[PDB]
């Protein structure tokens, strides 16, 4: 009935931490533009998701070694719709971002790497916007499919898929999943308009 414009979220993302197949802890809701997810035992705050004291009764040896290596972890930034991931950890962080994959022409399930001291724009809203634009023409179905683009997976030390020993994200010891609430809210407004 009219255009549906993107709205900057109040909580740009929700982060769920997992240790293999186990969901560990509770969801962190990012309310600030920056936020770090690390392995330290400090109290968490609006900009810090400290995984150091999250207990898991099913924590095995591998997970224990991986957690000791997260260290400073990953710094996530939301800068005007664009989302960046910076490896503060001394170990690399592996990212499975549908948005980057679409951008670099990689297989939808491709997982890349962000080495220490480096960063990657894990989400480009402009690209997602263009993708959404062509999707509204493919009807309701395709538009709802975009829900996949609003999710990012990240492992703290070990990678997965392609020729790595581990193939599914659930196979990595320490990993988190981000839900970009901005894009999701936009999708909801588009879907309700249909």
């Amino acid at each position: 009935l009219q255009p549906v414009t993107y709205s900057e979220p109040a909580f740009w993302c929700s982060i769920a931490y997992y240790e293999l197949n186990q969901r560990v802890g509770e969801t962190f809701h990012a309310s600030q533009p920056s936020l770090t997810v690390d392995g330290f035992t400090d109290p968490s705050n609006s900009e810090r998701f400290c995984l150091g004291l999250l207990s898991n009764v099913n924590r095995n040896a591998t997970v224990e070694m991986t957690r000791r290596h997260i260290g400073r972890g990953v710094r996530l930034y939301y800068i005007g719709g664009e989302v960046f991931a910076e490896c503060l950890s001394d170990s690399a962080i592996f990212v499975q971002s549908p948005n980057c994959n679409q951008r670099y022409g990689w297989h939808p399930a491709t997982v890349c790497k962000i080495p220490p001291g480096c960063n990657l724009k894990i989400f480009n809203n402009q690209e997602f916007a263009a993708l959404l634009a062509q999707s509204v023409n493919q009807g309701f179905e395709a538009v709802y499919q975009l829900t996949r683009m609003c999710t990012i997976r990240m492992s703290f030390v070990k990678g997965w898929g392609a020729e790595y020993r581990r193939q599914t994200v659930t196979s990595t010891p320490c990993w988190i999943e981000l839900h970009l609430n901005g894009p999701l809210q936009w999708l909801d407004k588009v879907l309700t308009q249909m």
């Binding site: 255009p3 709205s7 930034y77 664009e82 690399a92 022409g105 962000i114 080495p115 960063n119 402009q126």
Partner: protein, 41 residues
Amino acid sequence: SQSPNPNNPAEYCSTIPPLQQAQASGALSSPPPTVMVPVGV
């Protein structure tokens, strides 16, 4: 040519601070994206 290789971070990652990548780009001054939506189904 083709595209960056997922196995070579140097081809896609950066060491330029994100804020500076946002700058020299857009992200604050860039108006929020808008799509034109119908009304059917």
